[PDB]
Amino acid sequence: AMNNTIINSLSIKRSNVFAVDSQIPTLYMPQYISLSGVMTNDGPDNQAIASFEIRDQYITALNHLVLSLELPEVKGMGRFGYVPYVGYKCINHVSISSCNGVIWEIEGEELYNNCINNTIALKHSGYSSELNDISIGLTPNDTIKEPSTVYVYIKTPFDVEDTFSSLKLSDSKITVTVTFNPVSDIVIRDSSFDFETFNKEFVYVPELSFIGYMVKNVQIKPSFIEKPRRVIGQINQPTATVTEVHAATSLSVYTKPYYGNTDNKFISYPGYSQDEKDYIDAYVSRLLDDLVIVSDGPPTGYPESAEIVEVPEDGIVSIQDADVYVKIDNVPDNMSVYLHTNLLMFGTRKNSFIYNISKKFSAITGTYSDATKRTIFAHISHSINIIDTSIPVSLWTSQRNVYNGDNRSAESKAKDLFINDPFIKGIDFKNKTDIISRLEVRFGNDVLYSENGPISRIYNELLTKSNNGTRTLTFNFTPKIFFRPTTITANVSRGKDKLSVRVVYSTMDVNHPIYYVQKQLVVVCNDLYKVSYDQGVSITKIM
Amino acid sequence: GAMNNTIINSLSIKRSNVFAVDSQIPTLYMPQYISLSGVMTNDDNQAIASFEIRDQYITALNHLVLSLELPEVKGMGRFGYVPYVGYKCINHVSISSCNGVIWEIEGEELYNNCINNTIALKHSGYSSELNDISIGLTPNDTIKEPSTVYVYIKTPFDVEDTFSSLKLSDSKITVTVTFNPVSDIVIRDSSFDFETFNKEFVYVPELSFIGYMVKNVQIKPSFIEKPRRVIGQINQPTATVTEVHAATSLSVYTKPYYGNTDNKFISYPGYSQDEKDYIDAYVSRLLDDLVIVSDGPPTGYPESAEIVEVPEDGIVSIQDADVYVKIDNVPDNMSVYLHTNLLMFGTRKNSFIYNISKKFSAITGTYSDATKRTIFAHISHSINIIDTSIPVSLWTSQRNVYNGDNRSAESKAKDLFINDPFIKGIDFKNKTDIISRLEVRFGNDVLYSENGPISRIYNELLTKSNNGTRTLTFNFTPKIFFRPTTITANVSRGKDKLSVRVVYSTMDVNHPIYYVQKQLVVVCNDLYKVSYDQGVSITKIM
Amino acid sequence: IKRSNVFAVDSQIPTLYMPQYISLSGVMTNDGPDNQAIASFEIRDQYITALNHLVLSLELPEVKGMGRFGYVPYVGYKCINHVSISSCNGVIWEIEGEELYNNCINNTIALKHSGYSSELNDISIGLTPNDTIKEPSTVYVYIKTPFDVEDTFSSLKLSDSKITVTVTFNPVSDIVIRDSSFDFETFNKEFVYVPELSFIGYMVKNVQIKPSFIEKPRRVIGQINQPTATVTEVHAATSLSVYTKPYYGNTDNKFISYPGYSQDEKDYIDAYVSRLLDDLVIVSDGPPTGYPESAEIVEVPEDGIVSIQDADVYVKIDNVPDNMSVYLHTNLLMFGTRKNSFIYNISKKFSAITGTYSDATKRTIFAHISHSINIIDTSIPVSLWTSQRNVYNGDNRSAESKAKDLFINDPFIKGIDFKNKTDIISRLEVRFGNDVLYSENGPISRIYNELLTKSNNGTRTLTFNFTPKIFFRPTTITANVSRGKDKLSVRVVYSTMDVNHPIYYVQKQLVVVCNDLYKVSYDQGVSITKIM
Ligand SMILES: COc1cccc2c(N)ccnc12
């Protein structure tokens, strides 16, 4: 059965790769353990906090925390849906602490970031058409969403090498404290939705699961742990500084939008489908019904500022230098076809440049239905983009706009949805646009790193096998757990105990509404700590 | 230089070199892919391939792959293969030496072990060629072209490549494969001549594996985890695994039993296997009979059918349910009709009724004068994955006080037999979860209890798998290099058996799904010690 | 018992080092060989002790003008003809562009960084001499090396020597999909490769270097339509791979259709069907004009069924003007080697065509198509349809349709179709010296390659090394020399086809890649040595 040339080609110490001594491991028994928590409503703005205390003589070690949430049935009228990954967006903060203090904590967004390359984790936290499409209730008793459980993997450093990295409790009490975002963050809804009643009646219903380990004659040794912390820059300020950086493993930079100067209302939302094209199509779809109207004489029901034009016989309406081709089939003899030529329009001066959403269409074809008295659109040529779909409606009607701005029908305006997702990066719903033009990191007062493209994000996505990375400077390339991490290391004497970030943002057109979306600079630092287990668990910052 | 002046600036302790390694020399060996045709036997007269590996120059092996030749399929009717056809072929696999069975597995259990291996699943046969339902129009028409599929037979010997490989100490290994009846892998309609197919079909297998020829092999013993399952009785919420002495893991799930039906179904989506795909195939098969454009009252439907003309406002009220039907370009001599009771079920006369027509809220379309048919544009409905998983015979069983299936004979004859051996839950996606609570008892004591599938969450999480099972894992130690950690019995105290009780969700007797029977499946992973003194042997740890 | 602690471990203090991401600009010379662009980067910093993780970035220019233009998917990898890492002792490692790509083909994120977006890869159309077809863009190419397998452990040590990374770029026509209207002559003149090299450098305090091994791939391409290839001086190989490439030299490299960014088999097929449909069913007032004379365009009968021999095409268009009829083009593409032979007729691969004529746009809007078009059909060069072998005219499409055909010169195509789906190797034989080392009647070696590497684009691969990398000396197939076993010879038998299918005339080339084991030593700087 072997070929003759192999057997013919077949003193030195030789390591055996066909057998190995199956070592007896530490004696232990694992258990999936679940805890109800205690819910308090204080800290801050009466924010909801869950606390779980872990102390059992048979739990010697734990890891792999997973948080459960019961989502209630949602009944009533209006449009309602959950943000994708709803269970993660719920989370404002997680702390693991002993009686000596805090062992490890994370900001909601950073936990989410760390799990973003984990499709399973993401799926478990709630990503489904059931949960994330925008349902509409038609009756005060109609069911919008059914009840549901979501599961949030609270990834910890204790999970890297399973039992080797687990958290050893000894005889100490470990408290896990979870702070929840306000339910407004996790919910997408329209004006008809009675959010006021929903807000009062909604309660967070959490449960903390984990893998406990009952361990005979546990042999503890000291370990190291990376604890993340982040600094949020002042609004639109292109700088932030992290103080007291003594032994850090990595440093990440990114941008968030800030929508406080707005009502957080958006024209459209794609629902469960989350691709860039989904976002764009959802937006086109919402505009199409005011964009091309089939009507008995001039269309009614629009603001006087609307400029609705009858389409010439050759199908071309000319909006300044923009040509829009409109051919609708099966149009009644008493009716004509109209193009709305300024459905949304923005400018900071009269008689200057204009951002006009209607000029972003070049062809609209479709067929009229006599049966349902509507136009069924077939093919659209346009240049709508992910930004357009990310513009809050408030910006269209702002005092900086010389135009009325929002010339949609009332019916369309009613369909607008509030979106308060807490984990948005960049300035568009997909973090597609790169608004950072240059990044500088200084250790003390000396330049540590500088780049003119996102070469650090490319390396981040590569080394972590992620397609949603960040501009990240990684200092630790040493394998976790089995080594002490490599860290950038302070002088303190020479002033080098702080990392300072300066980015150059690219500047947008002041006549595009996107210019007025506020930006925030997020800098996340991972500091090395030593873990000791001598009478209670404790950590110690490495200097 | 290019190294910034800060990194250079801040640069006698005992250190590990992370910038070089000692290249230690491995065992001198040489690998080879080997294929074998083996021998076939047919003794319910199930086919059994057996392959003997006897060669003094093969020290070890792993990575078994079984290939199967699928023959050309000629004739009339509708015919496709079940997704991942290769795995559904396999009833049982066993690896034995002269000293008995070294490792064996049920077909469904090997499928489950491979379910997160996309490549393995794709090689086994997942393609529109294989899995879309084709239709033959003449007795000499070709329905399916000859294909060859490859089934990766995952074994404990692959976990750590050469370290885990099954060693052969001059012993004769026999790999024995038991095949499900070909009924199980074929989705067909009534017009297909399955009788002739069933007798003409022959499983044509070849077993390949990676053999290793090793000089001066140095054998050591290892351990192996051998799966075992129990199936509770029909509709019992309990099942028990006896003789549990050293288990590494326990998993619980549910299968449906359709033995009380014909295993015929109204619709099937073919190669496209998403939940939305199943639903859409179903809505599509119903729509032919649901909304009819006709010259006077539509004909060819049973008398029990309630087909009514759509009023000029487009709304038909089926009891409390309002259906909107508006069709464009309908001829002046024709009207739009709606079948208000396409499928309907009830257990007591003039009481509660489940009526599939009521799960439509809006149906829009345009009549084609050129093809004499209605082309539908938008359907608002509430059909779900369960509706698509109902055997037709349940619509027409004696419990139904109605006729039940009010479809056209044209619709009825397109129904399909599905006999997939590996269905789970009570719907084709395994979406619906009918376990409301699960209890595992080691003896009289409760070992585990959960109120939601947190055990499946961990299973999926810890194995990176989208389709896990409610699984209790006892071993968190790395395989091969460590004696697996087990849960250990106490025979003295009756603690040598694992009993599982679940609380099934309570369903409505006026929904056909209520009558789909279910079985509890409990799989236990028993720890065995593999010994190599005079041949290969295994011993169940006690 | 004596038990190993699985609940805690000693934290070893590692070598003291600091890593830095380092980007460099290169020297570009358009010398070597056919005036091919070369980019040289010199790493000569005394404080860069080790490096790995090479990333090449490319600034792609704005593209202005007229016509249809797009970039091949994963454009950055397709740009690379060859990468070579060398030192003042010669070459340490080097790879051919296709093999680098092959090595990265299951690294989705690497592929995405290289340029795989609708911005890049859909075919765009410029409407005026100053219309912008593509915006400027920067892509990132992960030059994977043996030095990244085990991070700092596997890293390239510089040892106070001067490292030079050399990148040879394919001509830009390889990465561009264009029509005839696009001014490629000008573009070809003005386009310049604008490359920057990044890498992770390591400042190591008191580095303790040791020797190691390294697999260096090398390949042999057979002559056109010759089913054999030999690799010489094979003394210590860790693997051997066999695949097939098409040769399109007998050809203008033009194809009827291309799907764009969407790259699924079904996308290729639908893009094709859409292109044929404009000529396949025609709503016309009187017999359609503008077609070649060899075209057999017939009016669809009232029954709706047109019969092309034993092939029936059902065609119903809705809402057709009273003064026009519906026609079917019964031989849009046809191929036969004799007058009394089997004919391959693309119209016969359609069974049903429905749609609706639009009065407003005066064009037919197709609704549903029953057809049997396959991936091969879409991968047939137009030339082969009109080759001398074809006793028919071949291409009976409209002139408007033929204007839209696209040049494609992607250097990394394999097999004979655009998804490498069809296997054309029927039998495979591998000989070490004169003795058969391996043979197979089915693609079991490729099934294993896909299985063992978790890949759906594998190759027929003989793996000799099943030993963990870096931490052990790799297991190799080992020469004898005295018994003539210093040669790896591959012979394939290609599967046979009916000679009346155009794809039979696609020229094939056999590709054999051998991974030879090298020893890395660090005496007078870095040095590699071929194991014998
Ligand atoms: C998966 O097994 C391994 C991976 C990496 C390192 C080691 C090691 N140090 C000892 C034993 N096994 C190892």
GROMACS .gro file of N, CA and C in nm, chain B residues 344-353 398-402 509-510:
model
   51
  887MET      N    1  -5.676   2.411   0.655
  887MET     CA    2  -5.749   2.440   0.777
  887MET      C    3  -5.757   2.317   0.868
  888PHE      N    4  -5.756   2.342   0.998
  888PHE     CA    5  -5.745   2.237   1.097
  888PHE      C    6  -5.828   2.272   1.220
  889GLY      N    7  -5.893   2.170   1.276
  889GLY     CA    8  -5.970   2.183   1.398
  889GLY      C    9  -5.998   2.046   1.457
  890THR      N   10  -6.014   2.041   1.589
  890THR     CA   11  -6.040   1.913   1.656
  890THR      C   12  -6.184   1.896   1.699
  891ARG      N   13  -6.260   2.004   1.709
  891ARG     CA   14  -6.397   1.999   1.756
  891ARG      C   15  -6.482   2.088   1.666
  892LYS      N   16  -6.597   2.034   1.622
  892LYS     CA   17  -6.681   2.104   1.526
  892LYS      C   18  -6.716   2.244   1.575
  893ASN      N   19  -6.708   2.341   1.484
  893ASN     CA   20  -6.750   2.478   1.510
  893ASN      C   21  -6.688   2.532   1.638
  894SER      N   22  -6.558   2.505   1.655
  894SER     CA   23  -6.477   2.560   1.763
  894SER      C   24  -6.359   2.633   1.701
  895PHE      N   25  -6.242   2.627   1.766
  895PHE     CA   26  -6.122   2.695   1.718
  895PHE      C   27  -6.073   2.634   1.587
  896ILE      N   28  -6.026   2.720   1.494
  896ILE     CA   29  -5.975   2.677   1.364
  896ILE      C   30  -5.842   2.745   1.334
  941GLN      N   31  -5.739   1.193   1.093
  941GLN     CA   32  -5.873   1.172   1.146
  941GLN      C   33  -5.907   1.274   1.255
  942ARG      N   34  -5.807   1.329   1.325
  942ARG     CA   35  -5.834   1.431   1.427
  942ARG      C   36  -5.892   1.557   1.367
  943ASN      N   37  -5.860   1.587   1.241
  943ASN     CA   38  -5.912   1.708   1.179
  943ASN      C   39  -6.058   1.685   1.145
  944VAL      N   40  -6.145   1.768   1.202
  944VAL     CA   41  -6.287   1.760   1.173
  944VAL      C   42  -6.320   1.824   1.040
  945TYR      N   43  -6.222   1.887   0.975
  945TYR     CA   44  -6.238   1.945   0.843
  945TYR      C   45  -6.176   1.855   0.737
 1052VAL      N   46  -5.377   2.221   2.038
 1052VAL     CA   47  -5.422   2.103   1.966
 1052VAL      C   48  -5.485   2.134   1.832
 1053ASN      N   49  -5.507   2.261   1.800
 1053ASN     CA   50  -5.567   2.299   1.673
 1053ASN      C   51  -5.465   2.348   1.574
   0.00000   0.00000   0.00000
